[PDB]
Amino acid sequence: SGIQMENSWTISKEYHIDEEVGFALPNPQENLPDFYNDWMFIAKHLPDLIESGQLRERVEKLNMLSIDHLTDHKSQRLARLVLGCITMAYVWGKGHGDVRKVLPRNIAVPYCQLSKKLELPPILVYADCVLANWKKKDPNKPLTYENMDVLFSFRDGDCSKGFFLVSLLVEIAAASAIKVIPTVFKAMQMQERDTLLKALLEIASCLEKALQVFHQIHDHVNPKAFFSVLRIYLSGWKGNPQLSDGLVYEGFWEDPKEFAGGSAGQSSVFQCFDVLLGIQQGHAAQFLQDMRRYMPPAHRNFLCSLESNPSVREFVLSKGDAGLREAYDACVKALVSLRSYHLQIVTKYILIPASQQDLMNFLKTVRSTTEKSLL
């Protein structure tokens, strides 16, 4: 039947989409129960521990901590972020090729149990290091770069604050577009021309603003630092020649298991508005559907219910209504500009620095598909 609704105005809370921060976690927990203090210390001290060569031995001396004291969603998500960062640090070390193929059981077991409860793979994903990895400095001030911080970083100078928070702020900007989605579908059922037009224009304007928030990335991230340092800890063990069979989660699985590292495909924004605008469109469709299984399951169910709703695109073009066509086209254009900027960032922060020590084709093809969706 499509999107489930909490009331006449707001989508169901089962989708875990917040009115203010959207797909991001609202007011994330910063501290775990005292019981997990040893976990919190390691995660808070990851930069000096990796730098000093101490991280692995500190992890190796942790006791087994049960997850039963992680009683609510926010604490489980904080715990996943803490254990996820520790796992990446333990596996990659200093990033120079001295990798660990076995995650010690005292981390692997609670991490794998927690991940099973949340239906997330046992590797760091976007939902951890961006969507749950933030705080306000001043609770009474707004959600701005200057008034926020990340909870955890990997190395001093890795630009993880700039990379993660700017990404979060784009997610927060998109939240103003996401909350309009129910009005779009109500307007269509009611045949309310103006309500639909203004909904589409507000979506377009919020996506335009989200693109302006994205532009801040250059002011808080250094390309060399990103490519040579942060990217190490976002790397996974699926098709990776350094862990060709995967990672052994000691005490959970006998055999090694492959899980993919971070991908921009894990943000739900692009598919949210591709689906809404009917814009959605080989082996890349497999990788993209795979990245969907790295999103929180409720967000997956939102994306799926959205596809089950009537098509904005079909409604709009059948009206001989320039205003609706232009408003739809404004949304499409905003999405195209966001993809274009994504390609620029991939080129400046990944492709060039790599050249100095297939992807372009996939992304450029999806951008042109979007541009060909203009009516």
Ligand X SMILES: C#Cc1ccc(NC(=O)CC[C@]23CN(S(=O)(=O)c4ccc(C(C)(C)C(=O)O)cc4)C[C@H]2C[C@H]2C[C@@H]3C2(C)C)cc1
Please report, as ranges, the residues that interact with ligand X according to CB under 6 A.
Answer: 124-126, 129-130, 167, 170-171, 214, 217, 231, 234, 262-264, 266-267, 269-270, 338, 342, 345-346
Which of residues 246 and 262 has its CB atom nearest to ligand X in the complex? Answer: 262
Which of residues 121 and 278 has its CB atom nearest to ligand X in the complex? Answer: 121
16 is in an annotated binding site: no
Exposure class string for 162-197: b at 16+ Cβ within 10 A, else e: bbbbbbbbbbbbbbbbbbbbbbbbbbbeeeeeeebb
Output DSSP code: residue 363. Answer: H
Say if CB 92 and CB 83 are below 8 A apart: no
Using CA atoms, how far apart are residues 304 and 275, in angstroms rounded to an integer?
Answer: 9
Which of residues 65 and 230 has its CB atom nearest to ligand X in the complex? Answer: 230
Location of structure tokens 């055999």: 255
Output DSSP code: residue 237. Answer: B
Q: How far is the CB of 141 from ligand X (least distance, A)?
A: 23
Q: Which amino acid is at 106?
A: N
Q: How far is the CB of 353 from ligand X (least distance, A)?
A: 12
Q: How far is the CB of 326 from ligand X (least distance, A)?
A: 23
Using CA atoms, how far apart are residues 55 and 89, in angstroms rounded to an integer?
Answer: 7
Q: Which amino acid is at 272?
A: C
Residue nearest ligand X, CB atom distance: 262
Using CA atoms, how far apart are residues 286 and 365, in angstroms rounded to an integer?
Answer: 15
Q: Which helix (H) or strand (E) holds 146?
A: none
Using CA atoms, how far apart are residues 19 and 7, in angstroms rounded to an integer?
Answer: 14
In sequence order, the 6+-apart residues with CB closer than 8 A to the CB of 327 are: 196, 197, 200, 201, 204
Q: How far is the CB of 170 from ligand X (least distance, A)?
A: 4
Using CA atoms, how far apart are residues 200 and 273, in angstroms rounded to an integer?
Answer: 11
Q: Which helix (H) or strand (E) holds 292?
A: helix 283-292
Q: How far is the CB of 214 from ligand X (least distance, A)?
A: 5
Which of residues 234 and 316 has its CB atom nearest to ligand X in the complex? Answer: 234
Q: How far is the CB of 279 from ligand X (least distance, A)?
A: 14
Let me know if 330 is exposed, middle or buried by CB neighbors in 10 A (0-12, 13-18, 19+): middle
Phi, psi (rounded to 5 degrees) for 72 = -130, 170
Q: How far is the CB of 42 from ligand X (least distance, A)?
A: 18
Q: How far is the CB of 63 from ligand X (least distance, A)?
A: 27
Q: How many CA atoms within 13 Å lie on the side-chain side of 85?
A: 30
Which of residues 115 and 267 has its CB atom nearest to ligand X in the complex? Answer: 267
In sequence order, the 6+-apart residues with CB closer than 8 A to the CB of 3 are: 11, 12, 15, 181, 182, 185, 302, 305, 306, 309
Tokens coding 256: 């090694």
- Residues within the annotated binding site for heme b? 342
Residue numbers belonging to the annotated binding site: 342
